[PDB]
């Protein structure tokens, strides 16, 4: 029988996840949304594209959670944006409620799924989502690092004029100010960035500007598109996480995972390097940070706790 992949949210990222899941033959897809028609339409559109490329996959649009029954992977993009100066508490209120509905859906119909959360704000929403759903935490993760890592790698490849395949980056934490990059564990062909700077490939000021561009990467795309946000690279990033699970690949990926002691964090979701295989998060890799790195990490973890506490405020259920 084929793997089944449910996508909870059929907006621009949802649709892109479906298309990539077909192209890559990851299994049958269910596109779920509250909007009537959108998931049916995209699903059929993608299904109609399939003979051109030759992949055999079912695409079902649904407005009911029962459609996701037995899904091997669920990818959650359902939620609302920060439109445009609405409150920070307003946002959390709407998306926490969505995390509660989705969490009930998955618990009922797809309890054994590997769940990948994309909904913002990520570190909090994925934390709310595993509490609300009750799934084992090693089976519920947030996508954030792979995306930041993709942007950073892309910018470095431009800066150095080498393949994106030969750039490696190491990032912890979440997006924006919460990102904690390690330049010293980032490389071209294994040559660490500091050594590349020593050799003149680029300057420290330029590397810093590239790191900042990475922090602001989501907002840059918003600024160019105006009416929506990034969907191609976010979709690609989550599909890479799903693929590592489906194929038991044991990729080492930066993902929002539940820490239970590591880096001195407990009962919370933080962007860390994880090995993702057929049993979800199989190992969380604990590096030995230096004093500056530790400071920035502890600052990032504290900022995420603050958000989680705001969520407990609005939804004390948690």
């Amino acid at each position: 029988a084929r793997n089944k992949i449910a996508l909870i949210g059929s907006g621009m990222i949802g649709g892109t996840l479906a298309h990539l899941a077909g192209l890559k033959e990851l299994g049958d897809v269910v596109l779920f949304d509250i909007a009537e028609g959108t998931p049916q339409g995209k699903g059929l559109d993608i299904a109609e594209s399939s003979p051109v490329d030759g992949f055999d996959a079912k695409f079902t649009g649904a407005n009911d959670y029962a459609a996701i029954e037995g899904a091997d992977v669920v990818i959650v993009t359902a939620g609302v944006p920060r439109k445009p100066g609405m409150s920070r508490d307003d946002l959390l209120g709407i998306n926490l409620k969505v995390m509660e509905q989705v969490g009930a859906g998955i618990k009922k119909y797809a309890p054994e799924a590997f769940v990948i959360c994309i909904t913002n704000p990520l570190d909090a929403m994925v934390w709310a989502l595993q509490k609300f759903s009750g799934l084992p935490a090693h089976k519920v993760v947030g996508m954030a690092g792979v995306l930041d890592s993709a942007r950073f790698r892309y910018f470095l490849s431009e800066e150095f004029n080498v393949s994106v395949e030969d750039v490696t980056v190491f990032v912890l934490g979440g997006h924006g100010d919460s990102m904690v990059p390690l330049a010293r564990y980032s490389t071209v062909a294994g040559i660490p960035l500091p050594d590349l700077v020593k050799m003149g490939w680029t300057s420290q000021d330029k590397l810093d500007k590239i790191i900042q561009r990475t922090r602001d990467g989501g907002a840059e795309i918003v600024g160019l598109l105006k009416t929506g946000s990034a969907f191609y690279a976010p979709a690609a990033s989550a599909i890479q996480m799903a693929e590592s699970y489906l194929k038991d690949k044991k990729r080492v990926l930066p993902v929002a995972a539940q820490l239970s002691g590591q880096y001195g964090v407990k009962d919370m979701y933080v962007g860390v390097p994880t090995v993702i295989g057929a049993n979800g998060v199989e190992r969380i890799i604990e590096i030995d940070l230096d004093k500056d790195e530790k400071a920035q990490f502890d600052k990032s973890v504290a900022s995420v706790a603050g958000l989680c506490e705001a969520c407990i405020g609005i939804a004390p259920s948690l």
Copy 2:
């Protein structure tokens, strides 16, 4: 020198074309549009996604036609969605696009998607002045894709083992040939005799193909199909770039085949490094010929109208 692909139009189809061209490593990509920001944002988003799968391609977003200079392939989705109003709006778009290509990409293989397809690609090759064998319209591959998918469902077999044969345009102007459509080489009428489905059901599947575009519009509400149309045009671009010589149903200029001259019609073509290298002229029976003729006459009308807006044609 990488191949260069220019996408004129950075809407939903344009973006999907760019993503596929990236994923399939077809070359560097330029997203053109009149709307500032959109091409640039989609291009950067796709570029940023590239480390994930590891394709190396440049994605440039542009608002100036000069950006398409030297493009090996150009895919045109520009246009807007009164019959003589939409024609006049879209003809003017073909006019600009034609001028752009003439100036900056004269050696390109050009694939037109803008509706109404047969009239638009016909106008576009006149406006651009490019050799007709290098200017084609995508329509058949999309209709053929929908029809195969529906048959795949009905018969519960792989999409890869269904072949269908279509002439003409979309909707009422489509001319399918059941007898030249098959599963593993067994023609549809033989499949019906074997009990794989009924004629009534086959007829409904043909009708569903006719209405296929309107079906997706009714489900999406705010816009139209873009995955299957994007995939269909990429297939045509890929056959050119790789000199594959696939036999694809495409809007091409006929010059005597099927008794048609100086007109674009959906016909079976072999597409290779030289563009349209061959047009296949099949022997239509009486009823097929009548359907094909009605279809060509209807394309003739749209063209006559276009002449009566832009006498330049």
Copy 3:
């Protein structure tokens, strides 16, 4: 957990099978053989190739059947290349492989490539006791692959657009159906009428497909074909593993279809997660029916020769 694919025999075909399974990411691979060193060697070599393209798959070489335990797919190329000496040697190999499969991989989909194919797959399902819908032989896809390749060269079109239809086995036992072979849905006889080729040329192509294996042996001198056969089996494996429901010519057990019972014969099948899910039974004309029966009678003879050797059957 990943799919597991067990390859019984690690010669040139087995190694190619392993490499293709790797590149296509069909799952973990077990190479099995008697020759010491060989399977462990090719497995390691392929494994060490894996970081280049980035596929993650285990390659285990083994000289003992226990390594194949729980295989989702087993592909058997084991055997040796007088007629009653060939049947005797390979019958004994089919017996050893069958008990191996019975003991360790009873739920596997099994694909037999050992010659003479139609008799050995029939022997293999009897010895193994596996359900028949789960034991098939590879022959039709290989013949069909060659035939399509020759036609693509003749017509100068993509291999993707040529479909051929073949029943029976290799050589003189092949029964091709020109009327169910096409280019983009146009049957070969109709392509002859358009002047794309002649009937003489088609006949030579058909004879070339009958002799296609001997041709490669005649070029190589010291061995036989392995790339096309390997690719052919992998397509079969893949349709099973991905539940594609491709319609493929395969040696399958008939039980009434075409008038044949308790015998394996090359027929069109639908291959999906349950193995052979349907045997397609087309309406043969009088001459096809006669050619089919002659081919079936010939296979009946080989099987009778086997029962005389191994009354177990």
Copy 4:
């Protein structure tokens, strides 16, 4: 047109190159060899496989160098498995191969695989007289692949998340840099501290990488590795053909970098549409410098023996 890839040598490596080149749609392929039938047979066998997977590529087996005319990439495996006797035999081959490339493919990117590699590639570019930035030796990619595979097993992670950095050639001439080899950006020496492994186990993996080729020869008994060597050369070719600018360890001509002039050594290179577009010059510590200089000295030694046997150089 399509890219053209000429394979000089149609043994096990050459056939695998041709298979990979077809599968990955890198272009048309010419298999060359002095042996009659072999290249024709492998070419035909692979071509006959093409309809299964659907790649469109021509395969030509030839026994005359004129067949390679116009080749964009040439991959040389020609050769033979007394040290001065081996150098004498294989230098003869590089002279003949050099003469054919010079006459028929003077604009090719040439990838040399024939042993002993750093001497033979050096010799090949002198005999052929092609620009040095267009003639390279494949060695480092293969060592890097084995090394990354062994580490991937060691730590139970994807092969895609291991990076290794290697200078020099094979065996004792290899100069790995543990500090520039990683999992997910974490260097080998730090992994030891974090207790993921021990220094003693790293050392064994390094030694295993040095003996990797001999390890495969021991398992196969009667030949040497061909899957990983073929994958490695294809990666290099592909970086040229698709202008990827991959950072690959390759035998390249140094002209000052690392203190070496007019000699081929394994170094980090950026390979793009112009061949070796950059040679990366890292900052070696004193022990790495001594290791590297010892390795370079042993390559200079071989080149001198070569001049002994062929003063021409």
